[PDB]
Each structure stands twice: as C-alpha cells, then as structure tokens.
Design a protein around this nucleic acid. Structure first.
Ligand SMILES: [K+]
Ligand SMILES: [K+]
Ligand SMILES: [K+]
Ligand SMILES: [Mg+2]
Ligand SMILES: [Mg+2]
Length: 136
RNA sequence: ACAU
DNA sequence: CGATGT
C-alpha cells in the first residue's frame, strides 16, 4: 500500500482464452477511459495484458507523462521487464494478428527508452483494477 | 502456490 | 468447470 492515484491503469478483456482479446487504459483516479484497442479475433489473456502495458508506455511517452502504470498481471509485468512475451499460443494463420502486434510491441521496447514505473495492482487489498471489464 |  | 502464465 497505498494506491498511487496519479497513474494509468490497464487491463485486458476477453471472450474465451484463447479467444477475442481487447484492452483499455484508464485514469486510475477518475476511471476516464484514455485508450481502447479494437478487439483482436484470437489471442490470450497474457498477450492482451502485455500489449496493454506497452501501449500505456507509448501513450505516456508521447504525452511526456511520468505517471506509473498499474497492471494486475504478474505475467505481463515480467514480460515487459524482459522485453519478451513468452506466450505458448500457437503461431498460425488464425493467430497471426495478435502475434504481429506482440512482435511489434517487443520491437518498440527494444528501440525506445522509458522510466515509467510498472506497478502491480494489489487486487487482494484494493479490489479490481480500475480498467477492469467487469466480465467475471 | 501465486498472478490472471 | 476451462484456459494462460511464473
Ligand atoms: K473482468
Ligand atoms: K483480476
Ligand atoms: K495453473
Ligand atoms: Mg487483468
Ligand atoms: Mg480484469
């Protein structure tokens, strides 16, 4: 504890896992939706969580914002730290789009710098992350 | 087991 | 119940 309210919170939403994947980022303090990705026909929860963080990094950098990012995903936080999304999802024609986006997100991480702290949202203490889709 |  | 991940 406690919550850094001056922050950006991100989350994935899906229909199936693997299944249709989307994500969004919100102002933690107000819940204002700041970005939303068009649904991607097949992906995994963790791919979406990863893309959401990287999109947040790009969004904040473009706006010269030093706010931290909250994610509830232990997995995605680690993938971003490593600059490598270690997904098990088969690479085939059906999954080409999500894998293109993941590949491109890794590529962005490997060609840009950032100081943005990427913080674990402590769901057990604070409840659902403010970017949550409310589907569970 | 923990995080989804 | 099923799945994705460390
Ligand atoms: K949800
Ligand atoms: K959660
Ligand atoms: K498991
Ligand atoms: Mg989440
Ligand atoms: Mg959620």
């Amino acid at each position: 504890e406690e919550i850094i309210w001056e922050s950006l919170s991100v989350d994935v939403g899906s229909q199936g896992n693997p299944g249709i994947v989307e994500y969004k980022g919100v102002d933690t303090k107000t819940g204002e939706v700041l970005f939303e990705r068009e649904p991607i026909p097949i992906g995994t929860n963790n791919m979406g969580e990863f893309l959401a963080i990287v999109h947040g990094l790009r969004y904040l950098k473009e706006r010269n914002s030093r706010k931290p990012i909250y994610s509830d995903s232990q997995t995605a936080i680690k993938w971003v730290k490593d600059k490598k999304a270690k997904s098990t999802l088969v690479r085939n024609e059906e999954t080409a789009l999500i894998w293109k986006l993941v590949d491109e997100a890794e590529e962005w991480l490997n060609t840009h710098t950032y100081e943005t702290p990427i913080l674990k949202w402590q769901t057990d203490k604070w409840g659902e992350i403010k970017a949550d889709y409310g589907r569970k």
